[PDB]
């Protein structure tokens, strides 16, 4: 819920913040809706999302400063803009995927609406970056299976990986629903809609394989960790860091980070439940 994320940042007057995940601007448009005498910096590697960020900058001139880039390149753009370390009163991280890239089928995130196997948050900014189609059309079985098993938490990895490598040797995979039928074929027609959601809602059987490629082609884990470090250094002592996790890996990474482990600098002040966990930099 949005109105309980601002509840943790505690925005007052004169404070300056960083929304490392701008997206459609929900959290940002909720901070100003609480207090307007602030200066928010908006980052998002999605050109479709950053378009709204600077569409709000010309609308809120003395408040918003739009920025386009990944977490991994957030340190360079912050320094090259005139921002020294230890400056932000609060940093916001809303992980996952914006509704713009899941709904609009031309970007190839949804298995519901058909587009190309693209699955890139950056979209067109880097055309040499491999798409989800390039991944399933290159790597071998033992490599594809480990990506699905770890990133996607899929138990039947070798079954799906063998189904991909066999449909590959006949015709390359270049669409979302084309790939969804390949993985669904590894199982009998019964299993296609057997898995239930958190609200006991029916989901496609490819929903985990798609989530693995979503994390692999965008490198959600490695870019998350470097973003946590960057958020720590540009936060001031007493600054608040709110992070919305959406699966075990994104949550275990921020957990091991706030505790200071790899395999004393934070006051962990909130853990709610789709899991939120906020902390204070000292």
């Amino acid at each position: 819920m949005v109105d309980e994320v601002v509840h943790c940042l505690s925005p007052q007057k004169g404070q300056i913040f960083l929304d490392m995940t701008f997206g459609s601007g929900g959290h940002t448009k909720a901070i100003l809706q609480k207090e307007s005498d602030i200066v928010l910096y908006a980052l998002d590697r999605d050109p479709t999302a950053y378009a709204l960020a600077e569409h709000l900058s010309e609308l809120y001139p003395k408040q918003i400063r739009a920025m386009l880039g990944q977490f991994s390149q957030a340190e360079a753009l912050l320094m090259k803009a005139g921002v020294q370390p230890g400056t932000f009163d609060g940093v916001l991280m809303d992980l996952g995927c914006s509704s713009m890239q899941l709904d609009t089928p031309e970007r190839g995130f949804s298995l519901r609406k058909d587009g190309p196997l693209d699955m890139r948050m950056d979209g067109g900014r880097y055309p040499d970056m491999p798409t989800a189609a390039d991944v399933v059309n290159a790597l071998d079985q033992q490599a594809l299976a480990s990506i699905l098993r770890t990133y996607g938490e899929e138990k039947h990895a070798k079954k799906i990986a063998s189904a991909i490598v066999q449909a590959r040797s006949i015709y390359p995979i270049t669409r979302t629903q084309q790939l969804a039928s390949i993985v669904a074929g590894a199982f009998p027609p019964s299993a296609i809609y057997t898995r239930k959601d958190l609200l006991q809602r029916s989901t496609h059987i490819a929903t985990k394989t798609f989530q693995a490629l979503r994390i692999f082609v965008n490198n959600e884990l490695n870019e998350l960790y470097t973003g946590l470090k960057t958020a720590q250094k540009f936060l001031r002592p007493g600054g608040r860091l709110v992070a919305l996790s959406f699966h075990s890996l994104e949550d275990r990474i921020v957990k091991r980070f706030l505790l200071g482990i790899s395999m004393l600098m934070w006051e962990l002040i909130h853990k709610k439940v789709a899991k939120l966990r906020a902390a204070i930099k000292l």
Partner: peptide, 21 residues
């Protein structure tokens, strides 16, 4: 790390990405 290397699998994709282009 999470087990899977990204730089190793990247050039294996690039060695495929260019043999098509």
């Amino acid at each position: 790390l999470c087990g899977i290397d990204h730089e190793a699998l990247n050039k294996q994709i690039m060695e495929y990405k260019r043999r098509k282009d």
